[PDB]
Motif scaffolding. Structure first.
Motif, PDB file in Angstrom:
ATOM      1  N   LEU A  10       9.978 -19.717  15.989  1.00 34.76           N
ATOM      2  CA  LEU A  10      11.396 -19.952  16.312  1.00 34.76           C
ATOM      3  C   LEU A  10      11.741 -21.435  16.148  1.00 34.76           C
ATOM      4  N   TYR A  15      22.516 -29.009  27.457  1.00 33.87           N
ATOM      5  CA  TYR A  15      21.208 -28.801  26.810  1.00 33.87           C
ATOM      6  C   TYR A  15      20.321 -30.056  26.924  1.00 33.87           C
ATOM      7  N   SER A  27      25.049 -26.982   5.485  1.00 36.67           N
ATOM      8  CA  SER A  27      23.988 -26.058   5.881  1.00 36.67           C
ATOM      9  C   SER A  27      24.435 -24.606   5.628  1.00 36.67           C
ATOM     10  N   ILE A  76      27.260 -25.912  16.917  1.00 32.50           N
ATOM     11  CA  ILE A  76      25.810 -25.687  17.039  1.00 32.50           C
ATOM     12  C   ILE A  76      25.467 -25.195  18.455  1.00 32.50           C
ATOM     13  N   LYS A  91      19.168 -17.330   9.562  1.00 24.69           N
ATOM     14  CA  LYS A  91      17.706 -17.408   9.562  1.00 24.69           C
ATOM     15  C   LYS A  91      17.162 -17.479  10.995  1.00 24.69           C
ATOM     16  N   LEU A  92      17.866 -18.179  11.891  1.00 23.08           N
ATOM     17  CA  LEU A  92      17.478 -18.244  13.310  1.00 23.08           C
ATOM     18  C   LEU A  92      17.410 -16.825  13.887  1.00 23.08           C
ATOM     19  N   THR A 119      23.799 -21.698  19.442  1.00 24.41           N
ATOM     20  CA  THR A 119      22.578 -21.741  20.231  1.00 24.41           C
ATOM     21  C   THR A 119      22.713 -20.761  21.398  1.00 24.41           C
ATOM     22  N   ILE A 177      17.005 -27.685  19.756  1.00 20.48           N
ATOM     23  CA  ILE A 177      18.025 -27.617  18.735  1.00 20.48           C
ATOM     24  C   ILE A 177      19.023 -28.762  18.929  1.00 20.48           C
ATOM     25  N   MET A 178      19.440 -29.009  20.174  1.00 18.11           N
ATOM     26  CA  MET A 178      20.466 -30.008  20.457  1.00 18.11           C
ATOM     27  C   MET A 178      19.885 -31.428  20.356  1.00 18.11           C
ATOM     28  N   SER A 221      22.440 -19.907   6.256  1.00 19.57           N
ATOM     29  CA  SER A 221      21.375 -20.766   6.735  1.00 19.57           C
ATOM     30  C   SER A 221      21.104 -20.517   8.228  1.00 19.57           C
ATOM     31  N   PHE A 222      22.173 -20.362   9.023  1.00 20.52           N
ATOM     32  CA  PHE A 222      22.064 -20.145  10.474  1.00 20.52           C
ATOM     33  C   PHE A 222      21.609 -18.710  10.787  1.00 20.52           C
ATOM     34  N   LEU A 275      22.546 -17.204  20.030  1.00 17.79           N
ATOM     35  CA  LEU A 275      21.171 -16.890  19.663  1.00 17.79           C
ATOM     36  C   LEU A 275      20.415 -16.413  20.912  1.00 17.79           C
ATOM     37  N   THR A 327      16.665 -25.531   9.820  1.00 16.81           N
ATOM     38  CA  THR A 327      18.073 -25.097   9.901  1.00 16.81           C
ATOM     39  C   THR A 327      18.982 -26.236  10.393  1.00 16.81           C
ATOM     40  N   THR A 342      14.557 -14.796  12.440  1.00 18.35           N
ATOM     41  CA  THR A 342      13.265 -15.155  13.024  1.00 18.35           C
ATOM     42  C   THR A 342      13.112 -14.540  14.420  1.00 18.35           C
ATOM     43  N   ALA A 343      14.206 -14.547  15.190  1.00 20.10           N
ATOM     44  CA  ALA A 343      14.234 -13.974  16.523  1.00 20.10           C
ATOM     45  C   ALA A 343      13.907 -12.474  16.463  1.00 20.10           C
ATOM     46  N   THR A 371      11.759 -22.454  12.521  1.00 12.73           N
ATOM     47  CA  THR A 371      12.975 -22.050  11.811  1.00 12.73           C
ATOM     48  C   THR A 371      14.147 -22.960  12.208  1.00 12.73           C
TER      49      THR A 371
END
Lengths: 504, 504
Positions: B126, B289, A121, A87, A128-129, A91, B98-99, A125-126, A94, B133, A132-133, B129
């Motif tokens: 953002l 993070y 997930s 994750i 989608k981030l 991140t 997110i974290m 699914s990821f 992203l 997620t 959206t960006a 979403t």
């Protein structure tokens, strides 16, 4: 002659953010070439770069126009991220995409490393981030997933009516083993494949990335260091490796084949490569310190991948009355691409002698891991006298084809009645009794040309391009699905690295 | 009596993530208290902590249950980020959120610094979403005088692209005063705010000046503005570009106030919370993070000792929620608790020294108290009343224990009377068998004067250095003039925040 291409039609294009406030086209070229020559520590080459662009021998991508020579502007707009399975890495990547987008970048990502849905997930699914960006920050992002990934069926639904992902382009990575087992009659794989063909019929997507064709035919250095190319870029022509800490990046420019005869016996290709090494250096120096562009910065420094392409290929053919189909274009493909790639190779070796090898190419004798890539060049082509895009044939003769005009005048037939007939026949001249089969064949459109011939020509071209080529196919809806399938298989078997949009 | 509160219902709740695999409730308390004593370098305190929890004098946040004393588990679940007006910063905070979400936290953000329209609400998308997620609840806060305020009030409406974010508006004094005095634009906005709370329950109200005029002196002296609150609107701490507020939560059971009021329970509760926060700090050292959270905890050591069973405690003493006696009880109890908490934080400073912010102020924690919803906490402890909220009902399948006992001594603890209470929606106001005084004691949330609730919350707030999750019950029946007057009273009497508006 200098600035032959600058007219009202190209001026309008260039006024959409290619030029700074108050700048003339000539002024911009001088700004850009001054900067390129400064980054080479060779101000003497300034005038040679100017001459190349003014005469329309070499076109430069829009990020070069707008940014090269400015204090902070970044003259690259082609990025790719490798997306890790954790994750924290997702991140970070992203972030990369967000910042890459902000500076004007086209973006892409490989998601094949991500866990399927329901694991200790899912990959889609990821995405989608990233979707959206793109909707948040006029951006474009291509997501790439392997075909043997468990979430592939979910992945193929992207950009369907109803689907929560509407902003992302897609490409699928298809290895040899998968392809053979599908030919040999694997029922699971055939249903997936029919879905891919179905998707490309309906939406034009996904792009196809033939993983093994890409990795078979990549620079030796990437084989020696076992750096896999996992995916391509937004336009599906860049073929470079991205890792956890390296995000591939490439500077684009194109040689104008319509004027091949003008520049073929000059140092044009050499200076184009020197020019692109300069653009890359400018990116590198401007991104030192930038947290989110670190992985791009680091790739650039270690690989110095360049992507010199072409445009006006069909225009060159039509200028010489060579038809697109047949043996003569194939041999001419071999003549020109052997010539350019050889000279680009020597230019890269020359760069190494003067400036040294970057860390990955120590002992390899060249400055750049890659030299050539054939981009869509939709804008550059239009800028440069409405030339044919990249290696794609013209869609139409009238939407007015320059080389058709001059032919028609020779036969007397350059009149409003003939052009009206061309317009009614959809830009075709195949209805005309006053034209020989040879003349008709020269002025066939994208539709009318054998898609098989395009793929065969791509295959021959690919042997001289160390990256890839944006290859569109025009397949009518009425054309049978079994025949579309043969066309894909032919592309795969003849070493084509990728397929871009499918038109209809 | 030890473990009086452990039964079938409270074990069902604890079996959804509070206990590790194969763990007993007794074993978990032991792991928790051992850990808390270890972090203080006072292993002798362990059995005191065990006694407090076993006896149900102190309840502990769910994050403490599952994580305290484990190797990697983070015993905090309350975070807030300041979102800067630069995109690199928005990207970093998105990362934080997110974290923070990944490790089990509820999250929040202040967005008021973001420029008007792609705009503040565009960027919230953002965070929306991310919630949909990552394996979560986020509260986005915007000032009411932000230009995008109208877009913001549409969040969670039929069709709106943002469906996962909770919201809260920050309302300054000047704005309320001008709105009252007849600013038409203000009133138009106020109407939508009220209409929204009526139809959705949202947004929360954050009275900027109420929050900031009655915050610790150290925050006024350092000019640290509290811009927003948390997911549940009780936490009142400053977030900045590099500090992200967090708070560790636990609660004193006011039902058993007579049992612990003269012990060192409150002191020990403060020690325990400081220990929990220390566990958070030591486990997050090196986490990129959670860096801004780690920094906040280190420097402020903000604590959130709350209460629960307020209504239960009243009903046990046959004190009506409305009236002077409950008001005076509020003063007696919270003066006592706040004075003990202040002194324990002073004793902690004596033992461990002051954190950076509090050099010269002679205490260890910037804040000590905050009143959470404690929905799960109160259900665990013999289904006592949540936070400082009245019971919604006397029979919802739980019977009000003090009512049950009042009927018990009238031979009225039979299926007939309980059937009558169920048919009247958990009310006993229909029963001619109860006196007027007894009916007052057992009024439900919706039957209690919301004005009295607000007035009591005003008195309570003087003794709480943070805030308090304050739900109101407003029926659709009630005229918008009356709802408006209620918001104004809350504001006028120093209420820091309003949580959900319920519509029974």
């Amino acid at each position: 002659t200098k600035m032959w291409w600058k007219n009202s039609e190209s001026e309008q294009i260039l006024n959409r953010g290619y030029l700074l406030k108050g700048e003339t086209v000539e002024g911009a070229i001088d700004r850009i070439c001054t900067a390129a020559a400064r980054r080479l520590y060779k101000p003497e080459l300034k005038e040679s770069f100017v001459e190349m662009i003014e005469r329309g021998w070499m076109s430069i991508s829009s990020p070069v126009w707008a940014n090269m020579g400015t204090e902070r502007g970044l003259p690259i707009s082609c990025f790719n991220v490798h997306v890790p399975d954790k994750i924290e890495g997702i991140t970070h990547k992203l972030g990369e995409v967000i910042m890459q987008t902000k500076i004007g970048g086209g973006t892409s990502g490989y998601f094949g490393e991500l866990r399927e849905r329901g694991s200790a997930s899912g990959a889609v699914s990821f995405m989608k981030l990233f979707d959206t960006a793109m909707d948040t920050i006029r951006g474009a992002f291509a997501a790439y997933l392997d075909i043997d990934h468990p979430d592939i069926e979910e992945f193929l639904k992207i950009k369907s009516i109803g689907n929560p992902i509407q902003n992302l382009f897609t490409g699928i990575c298809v290895p040899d083993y998968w392809m053979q087992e599908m030919i040999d009659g694997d029922a699971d794989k055939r249903q997936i494949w029919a879905k891919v063909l179905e998707s490309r019929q309906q939406k034009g997507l996904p792009y196809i990335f033939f993983s093994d064709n890409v990795n078979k035919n990549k620079p030796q250095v990437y084989k020696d260091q076992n750096l896999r190319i996992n995916a391509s870029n937004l336009c599906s022509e860049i073929m470079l490796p991205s890792t956890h800490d390296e995000s591939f990046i490439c500077c684009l420019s194109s040689m104008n084949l319509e004027l091949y005869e003008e520049w073929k016996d000059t140092e044009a290709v050499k200076l184009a490569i020197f020019f692109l090494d300069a653009v890359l250096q400018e990116f590198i120096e401007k991104t030192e310190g930038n947290y989110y562009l670190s992985a791009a910065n680091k790739f650039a420094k270690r690989h110095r991948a360049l992507g010199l392409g072409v445009l006006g290929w069909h225009s060159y053919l039509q200028k010489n009355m060579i038809p697109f189909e047949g043996m003569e274009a194939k041999m001419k493909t071999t003549e020109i691409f052997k010539h350019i790639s050889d000279k680009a190779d020597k230019a890269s070796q020359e760069l190494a002698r003067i400036y040294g090898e970057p860390e990955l190419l120590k002992g390899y004798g060249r400055r750049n891991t890659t030299t050539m890539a054939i981009a869509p060049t939709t804008s550059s082509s239009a800028i440069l006298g409405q030339t044919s895009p990249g290696i794609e044939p013209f869609s139409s003769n009238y939407y007015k084809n320059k080389y058709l005009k001059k032919l028609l005048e020779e036969k007397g037939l350059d009149n409003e009645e003939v052009w009206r007939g061309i317009m009614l026949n959809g830009g075709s001249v195949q209805h005309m009794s006053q034209l020989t089969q040879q003349e008709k064949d020269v002025f066939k459109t994208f539709k009318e040309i054998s898609q098989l011939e395009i793929v065969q020509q791509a295959g021959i071209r690919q042997k001289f391009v160390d990256q890839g080529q944006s290859l569109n196919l025009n397949i009518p809806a009425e054309l049978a699905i079994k025949d579309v399938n043969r066309l894909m298989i032919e592309a795969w078997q003849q070493g084509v690295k990728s397929l871009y949009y499918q038109r209809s």
